[PDB]
Each structure stands twice: as C-alpha cells, then as structure tokens.
Amino acid sequence: EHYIKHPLQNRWALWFFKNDKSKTWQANLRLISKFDTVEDFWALYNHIQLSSNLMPGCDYSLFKDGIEPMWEDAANARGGRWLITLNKQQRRSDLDRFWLETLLCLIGESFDDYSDDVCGAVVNVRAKGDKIAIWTTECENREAVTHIGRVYKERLGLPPKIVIGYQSHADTATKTKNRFVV
C-alpha cells in the first residue's frame, strides 16, 4: 500500500570479484548480497562503489538466485553474452550509466517474452578496457538472443554506426567469433 516493498519478478545476487595470487574461485569471488525488491536494490546500489572507481582486475556481477556466477553453471554452459567493450574515454562517459541501465534491464524484466533467457550480467574493470555483458542461457535460441540484443542496444542508446556482438561462452573460452551481431 504505502508500506509494502515492491517485489521484483526474480531474486538476484550481486557478486564482487578481484583477481590475485589467491584461490580465485572461492577466495577471490564473494557474494555481496541477495535482494528481491526495488527498495533493497537501490539501498545496495547506493552503498557500493561505482564501477569506474574499482581497481583494475575487479568485477561486479548480478545473477539470478540459483545461477552461480560462472559460465560452467548448468544455466550458462550452453549460453553466451551480448558484449559491450569500452575504451578509457568510455570509462568516463559511459561505464557507470551503461552498467546501471544493464542492472535495470535485468531486474525490470525488460525483454518481454524472453526475460527468462537472461542469466545475469557482468562488468569487468580492466587496464586494457572495460567490458559489460548480459549473459543468456542458450546460444541456439535465436529469437530470444536477437530480441535481448536489440532491446539492450536501444536501452543503451547505441546508434546504428556501432554494432555489438554476442559470443558463446564456450567459444570465448577456446580463445572470438560473433554468433550474432546487432
């Protein structure tokens, strides 16, 4: 009413990663918080560093509850990602606003019939250039993948002179070909 929190469609988990000389997948990856309302999202978002302020080598990731933040997870293994690559100028002009928009696309279920194909999203802060990506569950679901790509591109406001690519997780792990481009 004037007192119930506004539930999200899904419960989400926000993860932090930092590369090191440590265990990596235990040591370096840690769960910040799980949330399932709008109010709890914003309280968490407002409490943490902007991606632009993270040390190179660090990631944030947001995944649906039940999906581990790793491509080998059952929901990710046959999947892939729409990839946004950012140079150093874009770290200042685009990184934080694109990432918030990405978060909002996820928790707002912005992909119509195909929101269920979304697994999560990741921002990589790197010296050689930042990356944001939306992970989806199945590379062969052409309708779902294409629709998510199109909507995401338009929510980021990217003009036609730029294309973004989708790559299979397995393909990228081998060394990368785009399965789709929009």
UniProtKB/Swiss-Prot annotation:
It holds the Pfam family IF4E. Phosphorylation increases the ability of the protein to bind to mRNA caps and to form the eIF4F complex. Phosphorylation also enhances its mRNA transport function. Changing K88A: Higher affinity for EIF4G1. GO terms for biological process: behavioral fear response; cellular response to dexamethasone stimulus; G1/S transition of mitotic cell cycle; mRNA export from nucleus; negative regulation of neuron differentiation; negative regulation of translation; neuron differentiation; positive regulation of mitotic cell cycle. It is found in: Cytoplasm, P-body; Cytoplasm; Cytoplasm, Stress granule; Nucleus. Keywords: Acetylation, Autism, Autism spectrum disorder, Chromosomal rearrangement, Cytoplasm, Host-virus interaction, Initiation factor, mRNA transport, Nucleus, Phosphoprotein, Protein biosynthesis, RNA-binding, Translation regulation, Transport. Changing W71L: Decrease in mRNA cap binding. Changing W42A: Abolishes binding to EIF4EBP1. Impairs interaction with DDX3X. Does not impair mRNA nuclear export. Does not affect affinity for ribavirin. GO terms for cellular component: chromatoid body; cytoplasm; cytoplasmic ribonucleoprotein granule; cytoplasmic stress granule; cytosol; eukaryotic translation initiation factor 4F complex; extracellular exosome; glutamatergic synapse. The record marks K128 as: (Microbial infection) Interaction with potato virus Y VPg. eIF4F is a multi-subunit complex, the composition of which varies with external and internal environmental conditions. It is composed of at least EIF4A, EIF4E and EIF4G1/EIF4G3. EIF4E is also known to interact with other partners. Interacts with EIF4ENIF1/4E-T; promotes recruitment to P-bodies and import into the nucleus. Belongs to the eukaryotic initiation factor 4E family. PANTHER family: EUKARYOTIC TRANSLATION INITIATION FACTOR 4E (PTHR11960:SF14), EUKARYOTIC TRANSLATION INITIATION FACTOR 4E RELATED (PTHR11960). The antiviral drug ribavirin relocalizes nuclear EIF4E to the cytoplasm and reduces the elevated EIF4E levels found in acute myeloid leukemia patients, suggesting its potential use as a therapeutic agent. Ribavirin suppresses EIF4E-mediated oncogenic transformation by binding to EIF4E at the functional site used by the m7G mRNA cap and competing with the mRNA cap for binding to EIF4E which leads to relocalization of the majority of EIF4E to the cytoplasm and inhibition of nucleocytoplasmic mRNA transport. It is linked to Autism 19: A complex multifactorial, pervasive developmental disorder characterized by impairments in reciprocal social interaction and communication, restricted and stereotyped patterns of interests and activities, and the presence of developmental abnormalities by 3 years of age. Most individuals with autism also manifest moderate intellectual disability. A chromosomal aberration involving EIF4E has been found in a patient with classic autism. Translocation t(45)(q23q31.3). The breakpoint on chromosome 4 is located 56 kb downstream of EIF4E. This is Eukaryotic translation initiation factor 4E.
